[PDB]
Amino acid sequence: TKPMKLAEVTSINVNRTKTEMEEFNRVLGGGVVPGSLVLIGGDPGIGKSTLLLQVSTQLSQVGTVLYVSGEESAQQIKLRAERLGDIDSEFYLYAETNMQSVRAEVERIQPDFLIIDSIQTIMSPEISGVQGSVSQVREVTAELMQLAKTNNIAIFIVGHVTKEGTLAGPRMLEHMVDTVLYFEGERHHTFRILRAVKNRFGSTNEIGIFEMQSGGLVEVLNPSQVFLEERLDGATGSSIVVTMEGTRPILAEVQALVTPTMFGNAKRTTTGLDFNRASLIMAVLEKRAGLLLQNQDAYLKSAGGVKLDEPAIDLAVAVAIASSYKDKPTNPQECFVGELGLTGEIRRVNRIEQRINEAAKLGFTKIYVPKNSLTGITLPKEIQVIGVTTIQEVLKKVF
Amino acid sequence: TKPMKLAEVTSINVNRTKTEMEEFNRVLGGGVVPGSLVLIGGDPGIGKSTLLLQVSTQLSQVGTVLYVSGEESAQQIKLRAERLGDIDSEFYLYAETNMQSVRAEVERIQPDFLIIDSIQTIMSPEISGVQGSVSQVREVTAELMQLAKTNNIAIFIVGHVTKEGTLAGPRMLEHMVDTVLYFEGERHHTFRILRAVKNRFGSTNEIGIFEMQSGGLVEVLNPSQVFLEERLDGATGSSIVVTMEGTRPILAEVQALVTPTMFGNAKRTTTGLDFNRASLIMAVLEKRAGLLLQNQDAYLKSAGGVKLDEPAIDLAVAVAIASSYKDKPTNPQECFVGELGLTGEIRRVNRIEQRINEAAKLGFTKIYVPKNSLTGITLPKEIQVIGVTTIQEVLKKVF
Amino acid sequence: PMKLAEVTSINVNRTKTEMEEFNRVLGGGVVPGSLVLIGGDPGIGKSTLLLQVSTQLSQVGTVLYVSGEESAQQIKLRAERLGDIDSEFYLYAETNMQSVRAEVERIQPDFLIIDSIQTIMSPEISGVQGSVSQVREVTAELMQLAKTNNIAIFIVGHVTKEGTLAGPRMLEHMVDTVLYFEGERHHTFRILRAVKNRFGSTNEIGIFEMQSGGLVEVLNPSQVFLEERLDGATGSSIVVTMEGTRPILAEVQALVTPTMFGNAKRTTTGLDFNRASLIMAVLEKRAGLLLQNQDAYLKSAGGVKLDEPAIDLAVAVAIASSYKDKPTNPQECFVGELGLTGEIRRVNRIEQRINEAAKLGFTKIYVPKNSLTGITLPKEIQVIGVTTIQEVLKKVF
Amino acid sequence: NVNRTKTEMEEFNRVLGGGVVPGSLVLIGGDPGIGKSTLLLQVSTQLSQVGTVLYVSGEESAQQIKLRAERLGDIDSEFYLYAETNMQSVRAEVERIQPDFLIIDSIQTIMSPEISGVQGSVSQVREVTAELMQLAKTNNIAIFIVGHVTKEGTLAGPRMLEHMVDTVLYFEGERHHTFRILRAVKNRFGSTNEIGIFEMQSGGLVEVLNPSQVFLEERLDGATGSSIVVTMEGTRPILAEVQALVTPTMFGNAKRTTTGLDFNRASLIMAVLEKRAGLLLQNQDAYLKSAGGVKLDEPAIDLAVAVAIASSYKDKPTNPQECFVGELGLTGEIRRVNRIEQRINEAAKLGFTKIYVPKNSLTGITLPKEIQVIGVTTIQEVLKKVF
Amino acid sequence: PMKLAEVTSINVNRTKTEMEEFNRVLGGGVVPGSLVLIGGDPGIGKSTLLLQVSTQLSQVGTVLYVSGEESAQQIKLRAERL
DNA sequence: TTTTTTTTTTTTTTTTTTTTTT
DNA sequence: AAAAAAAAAAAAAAAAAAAA
Ligand SMILES: Nc1ncnc2c1ncn2[C@@H]1O[C@H](COP(=O)(O)OP(=O)(O)OP(O)(O)=S)[C@@H](O)[C@H]1O
Ligand SMILES: Nc1ncnc2c1ncn2[C@@H]1O[C@H](COP(=O)(O)OP(=O)(O)OP(O)(O)=S)[C@@H](O)[C@H]1O
Ligand SMILES: Nc1ncnc2c1ncn2[C@@H]1O[C@H](COP(=O)(O)OP(=O)(O)OP(O)(O)=S)[C@@H](O)[C@H]1O
Ligand SMILES: Nc1ncnc2c1ncn2[C@@H]1O[C@H](COP(=O)(O)OP(=O)(O)OP(O)(O)=S)[C@@H](O)[C@H]1O
Ligand SMILES: [Mg+2]
Ligand SMILES: [Mg+2]
Ligand SMILES: [Mg+2]
Ligand SMILES: [Mg+2]
């Protein structure tokens, strides 16, 4: 080795190969990078070995794959494969735990892709410690990193997780690999969310959602079924907003029902929405747009119980209230994003590009967004993007 | 050797070289200091080596740079460089991992600035045990502080972190080096913040905020939704406040809508503020300034959902309420800062100099502050700092 | 020799720095013949603090500053930032314990400051610079020098990655005083707190603010000053509250106005509105202020949360001054809990409170009379015992 | 058993098995600065009234100890100080005094220079301890040992000392506590677990005799609407005062503003008084507080709360030496309470003339003769007896 | 043990105390080869119960009573109250 | 024939990780 | 929010042991 000037452009471009799973490719950042290390953590049972077996089958159509498993015997893995089904043209399988015995086979198969079905179950013969020991994990991961960086092998490592929900072993492990994925999914849903917390080769904002099914993990193409309901005739008082949950844009319906107050102080009731925010929005509508609302009771709901924290919902909430009060329908493919100011201005929102992209992917026609958010934003040309400046403009255009 | 002197001693000055990233220069106390040690810690994948490759390029425009790394090969570094820039001042890469060859090549090329990358990923063949040993990093740190002082090389060091997020290694590491930086970001946010916990050459309070983007880190300059020209021109009931978001001042905007109640009682709906605080402020206004407000509803909001609960916002809240009740605008170039006492006094506030300086940087023309806070303040030339001591003074000056 | 109880003792000649917020932590001043240990996180400010101490003590006696971790140029550059060498002192930057022992015997300094015992070493043994044996022998040498020359020694000790002193636990036994210098990244105050001091109370902490011109002592941590009340401002009063161990001054403010619409609000901040409405009920029953038909609005100034029962008297006097439209004197302070019978009940730490009010230059403090039993009033403060709220209201207004 | 000498700190006796037995060792460990040397100087001075005492110190020269003694002020009849570290010289001074109560101010700062090790060496301290054992055995001297502690607290070589040591107890306290707790952990001659507690002061350590948190008796004159109740701070009984202000609802509607108590419990209590006693409280505001901010909320308070409310409504004073304990039922029955014996004994210790208690709870308890324990059945009976 | 296939069977030698209201809470008696754990509210009778049970089992067989938490003198002085 | 010494061992302290407990 | 289980390292008590 020698020091070199940066203009010694020995950099060959990374011809990263795509698997068939677009959800997997996107989290990785376009594809599997040769010579990368990917560490997949996640709770027991969540689907890590299923995911890796699927991608191993798909990659075996394009390159040689070696699947290495300490924790499971070859018959179990073949039983899962036949439950999933693939030609498995060049898919090698190797149940092993001794690092020298895997390294020897790696140096003859020359696998383009290597799966390590659990790092905590594979041991160096050098280190005396138990298979989950910190020193064992350190030595095995350093040897795998040598194999990867020397032979351009892409290595997928399954990591055991502590009861905290964070990867076990020395933090050196998270420092040394190139990509760290978590695989997780709460019991309220069937969906399994794959997310990158580190990715030296791509954006860590991309997340992939799978559903676990008999016969494998299948991609879910719409994360949010809860909007899907085609509207009744009439159906006044509904609007749709591209809100946000964690990092993924999710599109959700807001509904309102405005009715004349009787025999009490006018009272306002919500679900999934802060009633303070709704009271503000109703005050803005009554002031700036002249909707008589201090004599109306109002009821607001988000479909599917998705809780709408962020201020970007306020414009869609106002449009829902207006649609109910006017008793006139919005279009089922109009979508609304923006904070509503008490001076009636529509205020810019973060992540505007992702929201417009997601609205385009779900096939909406018109998305209304704050005019000042549009600066330098490139729209997808298939969806009409309307920049709006004040609530009176939105009401006059929608109604 | 055998010194021993009175305090009359050479007092040699410290020169500084600024990077082009003012957000980075700020944290170091105004620029890189020759012969200093700066230690960078932070979560895996946070952006440390992008930041250091950016600053490595900028220093490379004004001096020779040697970038060592044991983490990554020269090809990966060059691919990153192409991703984030034009290679407009080429510098040296060295993929070395053993300290003797580093010391050799650094003595031969004799750089102005040196970057180690991770101190935990370099070892010394003369001593001790495993990579990342406490025994190893201590001795490498001693070698670096020597090489630094013998040559006046400024050295930047990446440090691993524990799972708790504190710097790894023996505390001798955190004592021998001169500057210790943390690079961090909460998962609910897009920003990365860079903060000093120790800095022998400047204040630690100055943090720097970056956004991660496809072309690298970019300094945000404005951590807030307050973009001045957002204001709806004819807007009334809005005012801006300089608020401490922890250690950093941020702009925030307080909006009020004030309107007569059409019921036997009046609402006090408030988002982002304590409604008891707003109710106290309206009682101060009604008693001292004579605004008839018990007949009026008030609705109050903070822009962008920022939670504003420090006493310094009371003045801007009072001015927003008064602006709405009077239906007169305020100039969007004025900031307000001050606690409001039930006497109508504007009480002094903490960190007043930071607040004035940050109001100055984003180009505000006036800021109203407690007059008693003005003592010893270095107030910048570009902004007229208007001392005030009663709410009625503010209302006469502004309305 | 067992000299029984006949040995003769002379009072320690406690010298003082100008930083009273430092002197308080040592329990009144710097004793001679003594070891002080300063611990704290890296970067906290220990060297800045001991530089300022050196420069101040140099006005009283000879100071020698030694530092194995920092060159004399860096120390002089810091001193030039902090101020000027008008009180010039000796600076050695030595690492050899034998050399500093010889130099101390030559110069006979009144005060010695060692900025890292983790870098002094003696050649009689060798090893890692911070080795337990090296620090133990060096600190034994320092215990000799302290006794032999009556020298006050300030030692900077390193700290582990938890907030505890490194090196042998025997260290905290040999030394006479142990200080931790501590702070929090969300803040910018530094607290200096003792964990051991056999020459004086360890119930006192010093507070500092790190600034460009050094560690400024924060004599008054509250945003509460006698200079800043509006001349005729009614409806506020001062109370000596306690933040754990530290007496903290606080102002309570009250706005009383007729309840023109609806029914009586009791909107409150920093206080508790149940406490406040109790106090208004006591005033209305016992003192006769017609406060039922009044709205009342109360806040702590400065956003300090007030919990303890000692605030009741100050809150009552703030309400009463707001109702009566008669200002309280800004230099009078109130402490005491209010009973629903209108009695004023005893409070804890009464002496530490009166001492803090005296030290902050309050001309007068009101206290529950029965708490005066066995009390030791300072000279610079007038202390008034009161028995009932009627007595207070007659005396104040 | 063999006889016990008592120090004047009865708190110290009770943790030390009821008193220091002669001819045996005691080791007090604890964090530096906790107060070991102050405690042992007070103990040694109190024992000086019984016989000769020697205090040996390496870690503190005689002048500093004398300064501390003159701070505390206690008279020091035949109190010996000895600044020494040569253990053989200590042993010889033992025979030049023949003490009766010996103190070593730290085992880690005395050395027999011939034998072994450095002053910290486990062998050196163990062997010094083995010599001390012979000196204890020979002259029946009770020897108090100060222990250093490990960073963890484990007495800096615990096992080999502790088996020779007989009795070990730990002196400790937290960063903010004015109190320091002296916990006995092993003891051949008394309750193997106990906790002594002291407050540290500039006058020296002072016992916490009676509970830590009682603060009372600031009663004024004709203070209607006040009553006293015995309540538990877990296992400690404490004696606390309830105050009530009852006043007509001149404006608005009846408030129930309450602090310390639960306003639901208080609402039940005023409903019970309204129905069973016939107090017209529904048109009254009633304001209730526990004195001193004590979180006084356990079922046994309801009788005292009822008597405070009734005293305030009637505007007649409760006697300042009457105490009440009792749960109140919605039928006006007064129900049993958890630990009535301990409450009556605390009431007696604080010198209360009466305690009112639930009848059906006097069965099988030994009423102390100094206090008039009164059984009451019903709230109407209580209000007849008191008012 | 080494060889079994549902064979050797000493059965439960269930040994009573004189208090049947103790025996009834177990299987009608104590069981050899077993650990019984007793908890309870502190000082309420927890040790009094087991000391008395010892004074009743001592009639049937040898009982060794070990206390880390109380002195042998105070133990025997309490037992004398029985 | 004691004196290093040096392995072996204890054991303590620092530090990092992780299983319980609100 | 709190503890206890492994890893790494230094301090040290001890002895196999070869010297000086
Ligand atoms: N018919 C089915 N047959 C087998 N597995 C199924 C079936 N249906 C669902 N599964 C799911 O398959 C999951 C098993 O997880 P896998 O993908 O096989 O491996 P893994 O548990 O993620 O990896 P580890 O290291 O063994 S914890 C379980 O959570 C089951 O819910
Ligand atoms: N298009 C993008 N391409 C590459 N990286 C991206 C991209 N967008 C964001 N990144 C971020 O780049 C981060 C990697 O930053 P790095 O500086 O290379 O790693 P580091 O952990 O900070 O430092 P080391 O010592 O190299 S591990 C990832 O965590 C991503 O979040
Ligand atoms: N203009 C400024 N220039 C230099 N330092 C400043 C400045 N302003 C504030 N500082 C503070 O100075 C602090 C440094 O404190 P130090 O005096 O180095 O304490 P120390 O770390 O204990 O000293 P040692 O013994 O050398 S490690 C930094 O943490 C800064 O917060
Ligand atoms: N006016 C006061 N004067 C002197 N000491 C005080 C005073 N007030 C409190 N103290 C306390 O007295 C303590 C002094 O420590 P000691 O009473 O000597 O116990 P000790 O430190 O354990 O003794 P050893 O065995 O030498 S370590 C300190 O912790 C102080 O907090
Ligand atoms: Mg598996
Ligand atoms: Mg890197
Ligand atoms: Mg220093
Ligand atoms: Mg002592």
Author numbering:
A (entry chain C), B (entry chain D): 54 to 452
C (entry chain E): 56 to 452
D (entry chain F): 66 to 452
E (entry chain A): 56 to 137
What does the paper say about this structure?
In Gram-positive Firmicutes, it also has a role in natural transformation, while in Gram-negative bacteria, ComM is the canonical transformation-specific helicase. Here, we present and compare the cryoEM (cryogenic electron microscopy) structures of RadA and ComM from S. pneumoniae and Legionella pneumophila, respectively, in interaction with DNA.
RadA from S. pneumoniae was purified from E. coli mainly as a hexamer and shown to exhibit ATPase activity in the presence of DNA, with lower activity on dsDNA than on ssDNA. To gain a better understanding of the interaction between RadA and DNA, purified RadA was incubated in the presence of the poorly hydrolyzable ATP analog ATPγS with a gapped DNA substrate consisting of 30 base pairs (bps) of dsDNA followed by 60 nucleotides (nts) of ssDNA and 30 bp of dsDNA (Combination CD in Appendix Table S1). Density maps of hexameric RadA bound to DNA were obtained using cryoEM, yielding a resolution of 3.15 Å. In the CryoEM structure of DNA-bound RadA, the Lon domain has planar and hexameric ring-shaped C6 symmetry as in the DNA-free crystal structure of RadA. Here, we reveal a cryoEM structure of the RadA hexamer bound to dsDNA with five ATPase active sites occupied by ATP-γ-S and the last unoccupied. This places the KNRFG motif, which includes both the arginine finger and the catalytic piston, in close proximity to the bound ATP molecule of the neighboring subunit. The primary contact with DNA is established by K216, which binds to the phosphate of the DNA backbone and coordinates the 5’ to 3’ DNA strand (ZF to Lon domain polarity) in a manner similar to that of DnaB loops. A second region corresponding to the N-terminus of the helix 188–204, named RH1 (RadA helix 1), coordinates the complementary DNA strand. In the CryoEM structure, R301 is involved in a salt bridge with either E76 or E239 in the most retracted or stretched subunits, respectively.
